[PDB]
Amino acid sequence: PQITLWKRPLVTIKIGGQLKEALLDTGADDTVLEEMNLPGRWKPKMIGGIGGFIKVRQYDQILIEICGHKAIGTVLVGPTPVNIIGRNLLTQIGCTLNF
Amino acid sequence: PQITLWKRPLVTIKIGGQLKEALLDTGADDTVLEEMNLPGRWKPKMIGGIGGFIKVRQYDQILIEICGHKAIGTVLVGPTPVNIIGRNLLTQIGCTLNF
Numbered sequence: 069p070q071i072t073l074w075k076r077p078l079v080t081i082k083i084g085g086q087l088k089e090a091l092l093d094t095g096a097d098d099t100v101l102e103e104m105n106l107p108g109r110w111k112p113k114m115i116g117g118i119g120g121f122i123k124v125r126q127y128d129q130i131l132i133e134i135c136g137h138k139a140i141g142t143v144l145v146g147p148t149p150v151n152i153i154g155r156n157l158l159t160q161i162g163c164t165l166n167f
Numbered sequence: 168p169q170i171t172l173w174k175r176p177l178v179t180i181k182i183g184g185q186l187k188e189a190l191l192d193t194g195a196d197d198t199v200l201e202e203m204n205l206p207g208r209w210k211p212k213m214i215g216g217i218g219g220f221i222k223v224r225q226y227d228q229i230l231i232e233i234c235g236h237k238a239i240g241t242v243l244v245g246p247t248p249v250n251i252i253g254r255n256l257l258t259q260i261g262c263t264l265n266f
């Protein structure tokens with residue numbers, strides 16, 4: 069679809085069999101989700117933002133469905149204030165900015 | 168134009184007579200620019216992101232040109248690592264996400 073930006077671009081995602089709400093964020097290199105129990109192995113990682121850096125759990129090759137589009141890639145899990153879908157997954161679903 | 172998301176979506180902007188590079192960010196409510204001396208009154212504000220909050224100066228009704236498209240709104244100035252164009256100005260140039 070085409071999504072305007074009057075409101076936050078929030079969409080439903082499905083991950084690890086669970087539904088969640090997440091922000092499509094062209095300003096994020098990576099996808100970061102709030103604390104949650106994801107299956108599989110994970111590695112500690114740090115990611116930085118406008119306020120500073122946080123500690124996260126990096127999960128690899130995780131399946132996510134974003135408004136009916138499937139993506140398989142890296143998902144970071146940690147104390148983020150909002151679930152954000154970053155460019156690593158936005159590119160897999162064919163997302164572009166247009167104006 | 169159409170902007171892909173393989174790399175950070177950086178574009179040239181013109182503000183206060185100066186040219187700058189900035190990130191088109193659908194995950195940002197507000198526009199935040201790196202420290203610069205803009206004339207006029209301002210109000211203090213705190214903005215949050217991953218990692219915490221930073222203190223910024225809020226300027227009102229500032230004109231910005233974004234790839235030839237003009238927009239007028241609130242611009243925050245402070246110690247951000249990157250110049251960020253947020254939804255308050257992206258809506259004015261008719262920007263959409265498409266997939």
Ligand SMILES: CC[C@@H](C)[C@H](NC(=O)OC)C(=O)N[C@@H](Cc1ccccc1)[C@@H](O)C[C@H](Cc1ccccc1)NC(=O)O[C@H]1CO[C@H]2OCC[C@H]21
Pocket residue numbers: 093094095096097098099100115116117118149150152154192193194195196197198199214215216217248249251
């Ligand atoms: C000016 C921004 C604030 C106004 C705005 N918050 C807001 O609107 O709250 C109401 C805001 O922070 N939004 C971010 C998403 C977000 C996070 C928390 C709460 C709401 C929304 C995102 O859109 C922009 C940042 C910009 C950036 C890029 C590079 C280095 C430092 C900072 N990207 C980012 O943090 O990305 C992370 C995750 O992936 C990694 O790539 C880049 C860095 C890594």
